[PDB]
Structure 1
Amino acid sequence: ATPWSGYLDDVSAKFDTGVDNLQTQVTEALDKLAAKPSDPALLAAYQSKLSEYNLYRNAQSNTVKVFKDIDAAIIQNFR
């Protein structure tokens, strides 16, 4: 059995499945950096991964909110 999942959850899940391994990649990059904060290759890899993570979080949240605000209008036209 699968717990309930609506449209906004389906959009969030589409984002979280299009960007599949980025969470583990960022965790591993920080784990490697924290043991040698001076290697320039590690610094560059970490910068790239952190930037991708930031952009993905912001886009996901904005899309979810825009769809919710599109929904909550139609409903107020029921009266």
Structure 2
Amino acid sequence: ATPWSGYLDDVSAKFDTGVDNLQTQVTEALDKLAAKPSDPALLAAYQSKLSEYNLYRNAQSNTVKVFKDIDAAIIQNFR
């Protein structure tokens, strides 16, 4: 059936389903810019997508780390 998925997987995937298609949009913007690097409207378009992508990946991974640290501290008190 569907592959198994924990709690951290879900907290991660809430971003991949929140930013609807940014992962495609960035590759489209790069394929258009590489065609003619000297178009102001293309450079202006690409700057925004690249910045948004950067921030998205940062917020995702920092949140996964924080939850992994809240869990390990409880698991340690079982002993």
Q: Which runs of 5+ in 2 are unaligned?
A: none
Equivalent pairs counted in the alignment come to 79
Determine the C-alpha separation between the residues in 2 that align with 1:54 and 1:15. 13
Coordinate RMSD, CA, aligned: 0.4
1:49-64 pair list within 5 angstroms:
49-64=49-64
Unaligned runs of 5+ in 1: none
- In structure 1, the residue matched to 2:32 is 32
* CA displacement, residues 9-48 of structure 1 (integer Å, 9 cap, x when unaligned): 0011101100120010000000000010000000011000
Percent identity of equivalent pairs:
100
Separation in structure 2 between the aligned mates of residue 77 and residue 20 of structure 1, nearest angstrom = 40
TM-score (norm 2): 0.98
